[PDB]
């Protein structure tokens, strides 16, 4: 009866998202899909006990099965250690996975006709790809010479570059780098994303300023395009072009959306996440780690565990947490699984669940944050929204009807 799903590496998480995650599987995934699930408990109470081995095991499993779906997890800080009696302030589970699997992170917001966009003209989502987190910075305490050097590993002559001669007083200095392989893995991930979506791709740099550094990004993309993708792109009526960041900002805002934007100097936490957080649309933002093979993906919600809401849930208070970015972690993983397995039944299910989600909201049934995008952050009434469990139920009902009406 159920749809064959195939091999999927699941990762359980923490707090409010963990609550939502189970509701998704129980009400939206499992009644219709039978999966070869390879579940890992990346909850903090199990990550500490297993000495963050569950995190390492989860990562190797995604490499093996090619499809990973991750719940949001608590990234440990000093204050969290007192709450769980933590044996160590462990690494970020996402940092660990990214270091193991590699690849480019692509962000995408979920668009609904009745939910205003920051730029009203955006009817189709904009997808942003990006690799200062690698920088080595320090204080210069007084006069002296700061130099940056390259020492070949083969014993040949080191090359010296003067950064600055501080004649009077001190200041600050830093060194940054990028590996050709990382730039190549980013070009491949971006060209494959544009083909898998049927949208054009743009790369933005400041190669007029950082002529060598950014010039290398522009040349690598172009080299990979012309030799491995130009024909495949031209046979989909789409394209690839390099843009200076200034022209790209303006172009993006005058656009209708529906393009891929490979952004070199990009701070996703700020330019996407913080803007989304301030706009009140974090619950509608998705993230997908796309490895250079074109086979390995790890899909997740761009947001965190939603701690504030989880506390109200513990304190017996009613919550209205948006589950869409969480559902879309599942739908994006299942869509990629279907692509690999040539599974038309699974490809349809992933498509139908995304549509039910968009359609329910468009029909007037939504969580508090979505109601706030319409009415204004402080202007929501209880009658404007459905709570966490109420919304999941409405999605469930609409998913049933939609799947029954599709046979014909």
Ligand X SMILES: NC(=O)C1=CN([C@@H]2O[C@H](COP(=O)(O)OP(=O)(O)OC[C@H]3O[C@@H](n4cnc5c(N)ncnc54)[C@H](OP(=O)(O)O)[C@@H]3O)[C@@H](O)[C@H]2O)C=CC1
Q: Does 281 bind ligand 7J2 (CB under 6 A)?
A: yes
Q: Does 249 bind ligand 7J2 (CB under 6 A)?
A: yes
Q: Does 308 bind its own copies (CB under 8 A)?
A: no
Residue of the chain from 49, 89, 123, 174 that contacts its own copies (CB under 8 A): 174
Q: Report what 303 binds from ligand 7J2, ligand X, its own copies, none; CB cut-off 5-8 Å by kind.
A: ligand X
Among candidates 401, 361, 300, which has minimal Cα distance to 98? 300
| Helix (H/G/I), strand (E/B), else coil: 85 | coil
Write the binding mask 49 to 88 for ligand X: x where contact by CB under 6 A, - elsewhere.
-----------------------xxxx-------------
Q: Does 95 bind its own copies (CB under 8 A)?
A: no
Spatial distance between the Cα atoms of 213 and 145, rounded to a whole number of angstroms: 22
Spatial distance between the Cα atoms of 284 and 279, rounded to a whole number of angstroms: 11
Q: Give residues with Cβ within 8 angstroms of 388, minimum separation 6.
A: 19, 20, 23, 313, 319, 320, 321, 323, 367
Residue 231 tokens, joined: 């024909």
Q: Report what 224 binds from ligand X, its own copies, ligand 7J2, none; CB cut-off 5-8 Å by kind.
A: none
Shortest distance, CB of residue 63 to ligand X, whole angstroms? 19
Residue 383 tokens, joined: 């009658």
Spatial distance between the Cα atoms of 110 and 283, rounded to a whole number of angstroms: 9
Residues 392 and 327 sit within 8 Å (Cβ to Cβ): no
Hey, which residues between 322 and 351 contact ligand 7J2 (CB under 6 A)? none
Residue of the chain from 11, 201, 276, 350 that contacts ligand 7J2 (CB under 6 A): 276
Name the segment binding ligand 7J2 (CB under 6 A); options: 125-133, 154-162, 313-321, 342-350. 125-133
Q: Does 130 bind ligand X (CB under 6 A)?
A: no
Spatial distance between the Cα atoms of 400 and 92, rounded to a whole number of angstroms: 38
What DSSP character marks residue 229?
Answer: T
Residue nearest to ligand X according to CB distances in the complex: 304
What is the spatial order of strands in the sheet that 104-109 belongs to? 33-41, 3-12, 67-70, 297-301, 285-290, 104-109, 127-130, 260-263, 201-205, 240-244
Please give the size of the binding site for ligand 7J2, defined by CB under 6 A. Answer: 22
Spatial distance between the Cα atoms of 110 and 358, rounded to a whole number of angstroms: 8
Q: Does 78 bind its own copies (CB under 8 A)?
A: no
Residue of the chain from 209, 363, 401, 406 that contacts its own copies (CB under 8 A): 209
Q: Does 108 bind ligand 7J2 (CB under 6 A)?
A: yes
Name the segment binding ligand 7J2 (CB under 6 A); options: 9-17, 110-118, 182-190, 317-325. 110-118
Please give the size of the binding site for its own copies, defined by CB under 8 A. Answer: 79
Spatial distance between the Cα atoms of 112 and 364, rounded to a whole number of angstroms: 11
Hey, which residues between 299 and 328 contact ligand X (CB under 6 A)? 300, 303-308, 321-322, 325
């Amino acid at each position: 009866k159920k749809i064959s799903g195939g091999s999927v590496v699941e990762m359980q998480g923490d707090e409010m998202t963990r609550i939502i995650w189970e509701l998704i599987k129980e009400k939206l995934i499992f009644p219709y899909v039978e999966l070869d699930l390879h579940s890992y408990d990346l909850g903090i109470e199990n990550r500490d006990a297993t000495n963050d081995q569950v995190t390492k095991d989860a990562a190797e499993a995604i490499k093996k099965h090619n499809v990973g779906v991750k719940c949001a997890t608590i990234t440990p800080d000093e204050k969290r250690v007192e709450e769980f009696k933590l044996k160590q302030m462990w690494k970020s589970p996402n940092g660990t996975i990214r270091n193991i699997l590699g690849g480019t992170v692509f962000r995408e917001a979920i668009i609904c006709k009745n939910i205003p966009r920051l730029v009203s003209g955006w009817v189709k989502p904009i997808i942003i790809g990006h690799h200062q987190y690698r920088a080595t910075d320090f204080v210069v305490p007084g006069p002296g010479k700061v130099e940056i050097t390259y020492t070949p590993s083969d014993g040949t002559q080191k090359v010296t570059y003067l950064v600055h001669n501080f004649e009077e007083g001190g200041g600050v200095a830093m060194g940054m780098y990028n590996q050709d392989k990382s730039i190549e893995d980013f070009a491949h991930s971006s060209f494959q994303m544009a083909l898998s979506k049927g949208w054009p791709l743009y790369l933005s740099t400041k190669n007029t300023i950082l002529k060598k550094y950014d010039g290398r990004f522009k040349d690598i993309f172009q080299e990979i395009y012309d030799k491995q993708y130009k024909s495949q792109f031209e046979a989909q009526k789409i394209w690839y072009e390099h843009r200076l960041i200034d022209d790209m900002v303006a172009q993006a805002m005058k656009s209708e959306g529906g393009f891929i934007w490979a952004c070199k100097n990009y701070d996703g936490d700020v330019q996407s996440d913080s803007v989304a957080q301030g706009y009140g649309s974090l619950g509608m933002m998705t993230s997908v780690l796309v490895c250079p093979d074109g086979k390995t993906v790890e899909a997740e919600a761009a947001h965190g565990t939603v701690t504030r809401h989880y506390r109200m849930y513990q304190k017996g208070q009613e919550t209205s947490t948006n589950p869409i970015a969480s559902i879309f972690a599942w739908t994006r993983g299942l869509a990629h699984r279907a692509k690999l397995d040539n599974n038309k039944e699974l490809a349809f299910f992933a498509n139908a669940l995304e549509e039910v989600s968009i359609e329910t909201i468009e029909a007037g049934f939504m969580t508090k944050d979505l109601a706030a995008c319409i009415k204004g952050l402080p202007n929501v009434q209880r009658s404007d929204y459905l709570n966490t469990f109420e919304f999941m139920d409405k999605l469930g009902e609409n998913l049933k009807i939609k799947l029954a009406q599709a046979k014909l």
